[PDB]
Amino acid sequence: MDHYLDIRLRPDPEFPPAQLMSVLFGKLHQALVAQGGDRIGVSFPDLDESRSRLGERLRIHASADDLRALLARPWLEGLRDHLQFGEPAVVPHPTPYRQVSRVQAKSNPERLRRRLMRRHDLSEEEARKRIPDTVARTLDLPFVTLRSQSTGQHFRLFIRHGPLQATAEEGGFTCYGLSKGGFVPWF
RNA sequence: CUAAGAAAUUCACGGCGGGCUUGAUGUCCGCGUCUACCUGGUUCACUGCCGUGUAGGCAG
């Protein structure tokens, strides 16, 4: 994708930057739900995989008309005191490419119990002996804490940046901006 | 290279029997506890779907 926009979280005493990036990713998801499309990607160029931090930057990649459209929408109403804007410009050359993947886990055993007892009509003990409590997977990935609107549930979403490649291939994106085959330029 | 260097305590057993502790009592006067605070630190690791699959993803 040719054009990128960098929005920086303004340093704020009233909330930590994790909460601002949470609400920014959430309103980003709501704006991408309102526009649709699968050619709109995200990246976080302030990565730090030692302490698993997401930093303070948000880089959204698409075309020119999409970015200049997303500037003038009410998904930036009520937030523009708390973040700074950049300019939609071309990605420089040359840059590597990588992905943004959502990596969940089956770290809750109880959902797997409910699944195995709802499809098979087992008992609690058969589901307990089939899958033990050691199935919980630990993760060292950065995460964003979003809530739900209609049936409200607050969850952390882990973001994984993939390996740096030399060329990018075609592919879509979700409403979260996450990679489904399409890679974002890393710089 | 140590006041070094060494070592088998052990067999057996009936502590019990008896008893009145009692009478009497004023706790009591008095008291300024105050001043000021972000519960969030991502702190709700959730809910459902495709998939035979626990393999892998998805949707909010």
Side-chain angles (χ1 to χ4, degrees), chain A residues 1-38 40-50 52 54-76 78-105 107-117 119-121 123-125 127 131-136 138-146 148 150-169 171-177 179-187:
Chain A
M1 306 176 264
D2 188 299
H3 290 314
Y4 78 102
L5 198 43
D6 289 6
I7 294 169
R8 273 93 191 192
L9 275 193
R10 165 176 172 256
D12 193 78
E14 292 105 330
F15 311 96
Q19 290 261 332
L20 277 83
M21 210 155 265
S22 309
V23 75
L24 184 44
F25 203 98
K27 190 41 61 174
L28 195 72
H29 145 71
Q30 261 162 318
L32 213 171
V33 158
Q35 55 196 302
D38 42 17
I40 173 58
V42 289
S43 89
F44 316 96
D46 214 337
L47 274 206
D48 183 48
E49 205 44 88
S50 45
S52 199
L54 213 53
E56 43 185 60
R57 274 189 307 259
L58 181 58
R59 176 165 301 159
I60 43 155
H61 308 266
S63 86
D65 195 358
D66 184 59
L67 264 67
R68 270 75 149 193
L70 291 205
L71 285 199
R73 299 176 32 111
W75 84 286
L76 307 178
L79 300 87
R80 63 181 63 272
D81 202 318
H82 292 202
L83 61 97
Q84 308 312 333
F85 287 111
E87 191 218 328
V90 56
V91 189
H93 43 291
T95 61
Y97 310 100
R98 69 195 313 168
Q99 67 167 6
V100 175
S101 44
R102 172 200 179 261
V103 175
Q104 72 148 38
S107 159
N108 182 37
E110 203 187 60
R111 188 178 60 243
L112 288 201
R113 274 54 148 154
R114 258 177 304 275
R115 202 197 305 180
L116 267 73
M117 76 186 48
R119 301 141 39 213
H120 315 98
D121 282 278
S123 86
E124 202 85 346
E125 212 78 3
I131 36 179
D133 293 348
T134 76
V135 79
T138 43
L139 294 94
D140 61 288
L141 319 181
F143 53 93
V144 48
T145 40
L146 185 7
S148 315
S150 52
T151 43
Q153 304 171 316
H154 173 278
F155 65 99
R156 54 166 64 187
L157 175 149
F158 287 98
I159 311 100
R160 184 188 64 182
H161 269 271
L164 290 173
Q165 312 213 29
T167 175
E169 308 95 299
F173 293 90
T174 77
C175 314
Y176 283 156
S179 292
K180 308 301 307 296
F183 297 148
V184 307
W186 171 259
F187 64 100

